[PDB]
């Protein structure tokens, strides 16, 4: 795998989104990985529905949080609609996937990166955007404006985001806090520290969709 990956440069990343107050990061993270794998496999970059996962993932708890793995398993089992078909409302509502016609995309499964293993995560990022989790509760992360983020942070992971690239010192993260946070909505998080957890627990729980 190469020294640099940046799926934005491959046209595989949609604009940065803002989840708002709803604890829907798990769905945004999942959606980033679906948009990416659909671009990688088909050549078209589309936006898909975080709201659909929020409403329809019966293992998640809506705006009270959820599981990126559950959302990706939902897109592989049923599918997902375009974002314009099922727009983001920032609140869990009834599942309306039935009422919006056939799905726009469907994946074939979900694979987990071997946790606590930087190279395994880098290998998955070289192939596609990856859903990852991290500790975002610290003010250092909350107030991050730019640069390669080194913390301070613990590994108490609480926030799902998406890894869309990396470099020699960093992993490139698409957050769902709008375009005014970080580096136009992105954060570069230090890697190569020898901490199995990753900076901010970045290697704790990482998933990506599989699409044949
Ligand atoms: C993410 C966010 O919007 O910042 C949101 O809080 C979330 O999904 N958190 C996850 C933790 C990370 C994805 C690792 C979470 O808490 N998942 C477990 C389910 C939520 C807690 N349980 C209930 N019943 N609400």
mmCIF file of C-alpha atoms and ligand atoms in Angstrom:
data_model
loop_
_atom_site.group_PDB
_atom_site.id
_atom_site.type_symbol
_atom_site.label_atom_id
_atom_site.label_comp_id
_atom_site.label_asym_id
_atom_site.label_seq_id
_atom_site.Cartn_x
_atom_site.Cartn_y
_atom_site.Cartn_z
ATOM 1 C CA UNK A 1 0.000 0.000 0.000
ATOM 2 C CA UNK A 2 1.215 3.531 -0.768
ATOM 3 C CA UNK A 3 2.637 6.081 1.618
ATOM 4 C CA UNK A 4 -0.333 8.398 1.033
ATOM 5 C CA UNK A 5 -4.015 7.708 0.574
ATOM 6 C CA UNK A 6 -6.644 10.393 0.184
ATOM 7 C CA UNK A 7 -9.986 9.162 -1.121
ATOM 8 C CA UNK A 8 -11.096 12.775 -1.585
ATOM 9 C CA UNK A 9 -8.541 12.993 -4.396
ATOM 10 C CA UNK A 10 -9.982 9.832 -5.949
ATOM 11 C CA UNK A 11 -13.408 11.484 -5.990
ATOM 12 C CA UNK A 12 -14.730 8.899 -3.508
ATOM 13 C CA UNK A 13 -15.790 11.261 -0.693
ATOM 14 C CA UNK A 14 -18.921 13.394 -0.619
ATOM 15 C CA UNK A 15 -19.050 16.836 1.026
ATOM 16 C CA UNK A 16 -18.618 17.000 4.777
ATOM 17 C CA UNK A 17 -21.896 16.660 6.640
ATOM 18 C CA UNK A 18 -23.064 17.943 9.996
ATOM 19 C CA UNK A 19 -24.892 15.526 12.251
ATOM 20 C CA UNK A 20 -26.103 18.261 14.565
ATOM 21 C CA UNK A 21 -27.110 17.445 18.123
ATOM 22 C CA UNK A 22 -28.378 13.954 17.232
ATOM 23 C CA UNK A 23 -26.104 11.112 18.270
ATOM 24 C CA UNK A 24 -26.093 9.805 14.708
ATOM 25 C CA UNK A 25 -22.344 9.674 14.080
ATOM 26 C CA UNK A 26 -22.516 5.893 13.608
ATOM 27 C CA UNK A 27 -24.806 6.423 10.605
ATOM 28 C CA UNK A 28 -22.687 9.208 9.110
ATOM 29 C CA UNK A 29 -19.579 7.055 9.479
ATOM 30 C CA UNK A 30 -21.343 4.097 7.843
ATOM 31 C CA UNK A 31 -22.650 6.300 5.022
ATOM 32 C CA UNK A 32 -19.185 7.691 4.289
ATOM 33 C CA UNK A 33 -17.966 4.140 3.793
ATOM 34 C CA UNK A 34 -20.947 3.233 1.563
ATOM 35 C CA UNK A 35 -20.544 6.314 -0.634
ATOM 36 C CA UNK A 36 -16.869 5.434 -0.924
ATOM 37 C CA UNK A 37 -17.255 1.778 -1.846
ATOM 38 C CA UNK A 38 -19.982 2.624 -4.369
ATOM 39 C CA UNK A 39 -17.690 5.170 -6.037
ATOM 40 C CA UNK A 40 -14.781 2.704 -5.984
ATOM 41 C CA UNK A 41 -16.870 -0.100 -7.499
ATOM 42 C CA UNK A 42 -19.069 1.866 -9.936
ATOM 43 C CA UNK A 43 -17.282 5.135 -10.733
ATOM 44 C CA UNK A 44 -20.171 7.292 -9.462
ATOM 45 C CA UNK A 45 -20.092 9.317 -6.262
ATOM 46 C CA UNK A 46 -23.533 9.534 -4.708
ATOM 47 C CA UNK A 47 -24.807 10.683 -1.368
ATOM 48 C CA UNK A 48 -26.741 8.153 0.665
ATOM 49 C CA UNK A 49 -29.104 8.472 3.564
ATOM 50 C CA UNK A 50 -27.787 8.761 7.094
ATOM 51 C CA UNK A 51 -31.424 9.320 8.022
ATOM 52 C CA UNK A 52 -32.399 5.954 6.590
ATOM 53 C CA UNK A 53 -29.924 4.216 8.892
ATOM 54 C CA UNK A 54 -31.057 6.345 11.838
ATOM 55 C CA UNK A 55 -34.692 5.356 11.295
ATOM 56 C CA UNK A 56 -34.255 1.781 10.138
ATOM 57 C CA UNK A 57 -31.328 0.229 11.980
ATOM 58 C CA UNK A 58 -33.269 -1.673 14.629
ATOM 59 C CA UNK A 59 -30.079 -2.555 16.567
ATOM 60 C CA UNK A 60 -29.057 1.079 16.913
ATOM 61 C CA UNK A 61 -30.911 3.497 19.149
ATOM 62 C CA UNK A 62 -31.539 6.361 16.746
ATOM 63 C CA UNK A 63 -30.148 9.641 18.033
ATOM 64 C CA UNK A 64 -29.061 7.942 21.232
ATOM 65 C CA UNK A 65 -26.208 6.269 19.386
ATOM 66 C CA UNK A 66 -25.667 3.115 17.443
ATOM 67 C CA UNK A 67 -23.259 0.748 15.792
ATOM 68 C CA UNK A 68 -21.530 1.427 12.469
ATOM 69 C CA UNK A 69 -21.392 -2.346 12.016
ATOM 70 C CA UNK A 70 -25.167 -2.621 12.415
ATOM 71 C CA UNK A 71 -25.738 0.155 9.856
ATOM 72 C CA UNK A 72 -23.406 -1.406 7.313
ATOM 73 C CA UNK A 73 -25.074 -4.760 7.846
ATOM 74 C CA UNK A 74 -28.387 -2.996 7.178
ATOM 75 C CA UNK A 75 -27.144 -1.619 3.857
ATOM 76 C CA UNK A 76 -25.835 -5.033 2.873
ATOM 77 C CA UNK A 77 -29.041 -6.845 3.895
ATOM 78 C CA UNK A 78 -31.548 -4.394 2.380
ATOM 79 C CA UNK A 79 -29.825 -1.382 0.865
ATOM 80 C CA UNK A 80 -29.781 2.367 1.213
ATOM 81 C CA UNK A 81 -31.475 5.261 -0.538
ATOM 82 C CA UNK A 82 -29.970 8.367 -2.019
ATOM 83 C CA UNK A 83 -29.669 11.225 0.449
ATOM 84 C CA UNK A 84 -31.983 13.412 -1.665
ATOM 85 C CA UNK A 85 -34.644 10.665 -1.422
ATOM 86 C CA UNK A 86 -34.335 10.278 2.365
ATOM 87 C CA UNK A 87 -32.829 13.532 3.629
ATOM 88 C CA UNK A 88 -31.275 14.125 7.001
ATOM 89 C CA UNK A 89 -33.608 15.440 9.666
ATOM 90 C CA UNK A 90 -31.450 15.177 12.777
ATOM 91 C CA UNK A 91 -34.103 13.167 14.626
ATOM 92 C CA UNK A 92 -35.074 9.521 14.606
ATOM 93 C CA UNK A 93 -38.405 8.942 12.896
ATOM 94 C CA UNK A 94 -40.271 5.901 11.663
ATOM 95 C CA UNK A 95 -38.413 3.766 9.155
ATOM 96 C CA UNK A 96 -39.539 4.978 5.728
ATOM 97 C CA UNK A 97 -37.239 2.838 3.543
ATOM 98 C CA UNK A 98 -40.327 0.958 2.398
ATOM 99 C CA UNK A 99 -42.106 4.163 1.353
ATOM 100 C CA UNK A 100 -39.273 5.568 -0.788
ATOM 101 C CA UNK A 101 -39.221 2.969 -3.515
ATOM 102 C CA UNK A 102 -36.392 0.644 -4.417
ATOM 103 C CA UNK A 103 -33.001 1.150 -2.805
ATOM 104 C CA UNK A 104 -30.352 3.158 -4.640
ATOM 105 C CA UNK A 105 -27.401 0.984 -3.639
ATOM 106 C CA UNK A 106 -26.813 -2.241 -1.782
ATOM 107 C CA UNK A 107 -23.600 -3.766 -0.495
ATOM 108 C CA UNK A 108 -22.647 -7.394 -0.042
ATOM 109 C CA UNK A 109 -21.414 -7.490 3.525
ATOM 110 C CA UNK A 110 -19.395 -5.975 6.333
ATOM 111 C CA UNK A 111 -15.859 -6.752 7.386
ATOM 112 C CA UNK A 112 -14.085 -5.668 10.524
ATOM 113 C CA UNK A 113 -10.530 -4.481 10.597
ATOM 114 C CA UNK A 114 -8.478 -6.460 13.075
ATOM 115 C CA UNK A 115 -8.671 -4.075 16.062
ATOM 116 C CA UNK A 116 -5.690 -2.473 17.764
ATOM 117 C CA UNK A 117 -3.600 -2.947 14.644
ATOM 118 C CA UNK A 118 -2.504 0.173 12.793
ATOM 119 C CA UNK A 119 -1.317 -1.593 9.654
ATOM 120 C CA UNK A 120 -4.542 -3.547 9.326
ATOM 121 C CA UNK A 121 -6.453 -0.278 9.384
ATOM 122 C CA UNK A 122 -4.057 1.379 6.923
ATOM 123 C CA UNK A 123 -4.441 -1.600 4.596
ATOM 124 C CA UNK A 124 -8.234 -1.173 4.698
ATOM 125 C CA UNK A 125 -7.925 2.567 4.057
ATOM 126 C CA UNK A 126 -5.717 1.864 1.061
ATOM 127 C CA UNK A 127 -8.616 -0.120 -0.401
ATOM 128 C CA UNK A 128 -11.570 2.070 0.665
ATOM 129 C CA UNK A 129 -12.956 4.474 3.269
ATOM 130 C CA UNK A 130 -13.327 2.741 6.624
ATOM 131 C CA UNK A 131 -15.743 3.330 9.476
ATOM 132 C CA UNK A 132 -13.720 3.935 12.630
ATOM 133 C CA UNK A 133 -14.477 5.076 16.145
ATOM 134 C CA UNK A 134 -12.533 7.379 18.426
ATOM 135 C CA UNK A 135 -12.742 9.363 21.642
ATOM 136 C CA UNK A 136 -14.108 12.775 20.673
ATOM 137 C CA UNK A 137 -15.213 13.925 24.134
ATOM 138 C CA UNK A 138 -11.964 15.722 24.987
ATOM 139 C CA UNK A 139 -11.831 19.477 24.457
ATOM 140 C CA UNK A 140 -8.570 19.092 22.563
ATOM 141 C CA UNK A 141 -10.458 17.089 19.934
ATOM 142 C CA UNK A 142 -13.577 19.267 20.190
ATOM 143 C CA UNK A 143 -11.546 22.440 19.616
ATOM 144 C CA UNK A 144 -9.239 20.933 17.003
ATOM 145 C CA UNK A 145 -8.625 23.436 14.235
ATOM 146 C CA UNK A 146 -5.939 21.815 12.122
ATOM 147 C CA UNK A 147 -2.626 20.068 11.938
ATOM 148 C CA UNK A 148 -1.771 16.490 12.779
ATOM 149 C CA UNK A 149 -3.741 15.814 15.952
ATOM 150 C CA UNK A 150 -1.792 13.998 18.671
ATOM 151 C CA UNK A 151 -4.263 14.405 21.527
ATOM 152 C CA UNK A 152 -4.348 14.682 24.461
ATOM 153 C CA UNK A 153 -7.078 12.022 24.384
ATOM 154 C CA UNK A 154 -7.862 8.696 25.991
ATOM 155 C CA UNK A 155 -9.102 5.545 24.326
ATOM 156 C CA UNK A 156 -12.647 5.859 25.736
ATOM 157 C CA UNK A 157 -14.190 5.690 22.285
ATOM 158 C CA UNK A 158 -17.552 7.356 21.872
ATOM 159 C CA UNK A 159 -17.734 8.757 18.336
ATOM 160 C CA UNK A 160 -17.917 7.139 14.915
ATOM 161 C CA UNK A 161 -16.158 8.861 12.010
ATOM 162 C CA UNK A 162 -14.599 7.733 8.774
ATOM 163 C CA UNK A 163 -11.005 7.159 7.736
ATOM 164 C CA UNK A 164 -10.610 8.309 4.124
ATOM 165 C CA UNK A 165 -6.830 8.443 3.812
ATOM 166 C CA UNK A 166 -3.521 8.477 5.603
ATOM 167 C CA UNK A 167 0.064 9.608 5.426
ATOM 168 C CA UNK A 168 3.389 8.711 7.024
ATOM 169 C CA UNK A 169 2.379 10.312 10.335
ATOM 170 C CA UNK A 170 -1.371 10.444 10.152
ATOM 171 C CA UNK A 171 -4.733 8.936 9.348
ATOM 172 C CA UNK A 172 -7.163 11.215 7.533
ATOM 173 C CA UNK A 173 -10.583 11.388 9.193
ATOM 174 C CA UNK A 174 -13.882 12.737 7.864
ATOM 175 C CA UNK A 175 -15.890 13.964 10.826
ATOM 176 C CA UNK A 176 -19.619 14.736 10.763
ATOM 177 C CA UNK A 177 -19.451 18.034 12.606
ATOM 178 C CA UNK A 178 -19.816 20.316 9.596
ATOM 179 C CA UNK A 179 -17.303 22.058 7.392
ATOM 180 C CA UNK A 180 -16.250 24.595 10.060
ATOM 181 C CA UNK A 181 -14.608 22.059 12.366
ATOM 182 C CA UNK A 182 -11.013 21.004 11.929
ATOM 183 C CA UNK A 183 -9.462 21.040 8.464
ATOM 184 C CA UNK A 184 -12.670 21.848 6.551
ATOM 185 C CA UNK A 185 -14.406 19.090 8.471
ATOM 186 C CA UNK A 186 -11.458 16.706 8.482
ATOM 187 C CA UNK A 187 -8.865 15.826 11.061
ATOM 188 C CA UNK A 188 -5.460 14.310 10.561
ATOM 189 C CA UNK A 189 -4.720 12.077 13.553
ATOM 190 C CA UNK A 190 -1.144 11.088 14.394
ATOM 191 C CA UNK A 191 -0.196 7.474 13.709
ATOM 192 C CA UNK A 192 2.972 5.502 14.310
ATOM 193 C CA UNK A 193 3.081 6.173 18.072
ATOM 194 C CA UNK A 194 3.336 2.488 18.971
ATOM 195 C CA UNK A 195 0.169 2.692 21.047
ATOM 196 C CA UNK A 196 -1.933 -0.301 20.048
ATOM 197 C CA UNK A 197 -5.091 1.683 20.777
ATOM 198 C CA UNK A 198 -4.197 4.427 18.325
ATOM 199 C CA UNK A 199 -4.327 8.115 19.122
ATOM 200 C CA UNK A 200 -7.783 8.639 20.687
ATOM 201 C CA UNK A 201 -8.488 4.906 20.490
ATOM 202 C CA UNK A 202 -8.579 5.168 16.700
ATOM 203 C CA UNK A 203 -7.907 1.439 16.253
ATOM 204 C CA UNK A 204 -10.638 0.207 18.609
ATOM 205 C CA UNK A 205 -13.457 -0.736 16.237
ATOM 206 C CA UNK A 206 -13.205 -0.243 12.491
ATOM 207 C CA UNK A 207 -15.515 -1.610 9.815
ATOM 208 C CA UNK A 208 -15.912 -1.278 6.095
ATOM 209 C CA UNK A 209 -18.552 -2.511 3.665
ATOM 210 C CA UNK A 210 -17.786 -5.174 1.126
ATOM 211 C CA UNK A 211 -19.304 -4.888 -2.337
ATOM 212 C CA UNK A 212 -18.601 -7.331 -5.133
HETATM 213 C C1 LIG B 1 -22.026 9.037 18.124
HETATM 214 C C2 LIG B 1 -22.135 10.558 17.997
HETATM 215 O O1 LIG B 1 -23.149 11.041 17.501
HETATM 216 O O2 LIG B 1 -21.132 11.230 18.402
HETATM 217 C C3 LIG B 1 -22.994 8.367 19.105
HETATM 218 O O3 LIG B 1 -22.903 8.938 20.390
HETATM 219 C C4 LIG B 1 -22.754 6.848 19.079
HETATM 220 O O4 LIG B 1 -23.240 6.156 18.194
HETATM 221 N N1 LIG B 1 -21.979 6.335 20.047
HETATM 222 C C5 LIG B 1 -21.657 4.921 20.118
HETATM 223 C C6 LIG B 1 -20.192 4.753 20.479
HETATM 224 C C7 LIG B 1 -19.216 4.784 19.309
HETATM 225 C C8 LIG B 1 -19.962 4.509 18.005
HETATM 226 C C9 LIG B 1 -18.119 3.747 19.541
HETATM 227 C C10 LIG B 1 -22.491 4.223 21.189
HETATM 228 O O5 LIG B 1 -22.671 4.755 22.279
HETATM 229 N N2 LIG B 1 -22.959 3.016 20.834
HETATM 230 C C11 LIG B 1 -23.765 2.162 21.682
HETATM 231 C C12 LIG B 1 -25.259 2.452 21.581
HETATM 232 C C13 LIG B 1 -25.669 3.740 22.284
HETATM 233 C C14 LIG B 1 -25.775 3.539 23.792
HETATM 234 N N3 LIG B 1 -26.925 2.726 24.143
HETATM 235 C C15 LIG B 1 -28.191 3.151 24.093
HETATM 236 N N4 LIG B 1 -29.170 2.311 24.436
HETATM 237 N N5 LIG B 1 -28.523 4.375 23.721
#
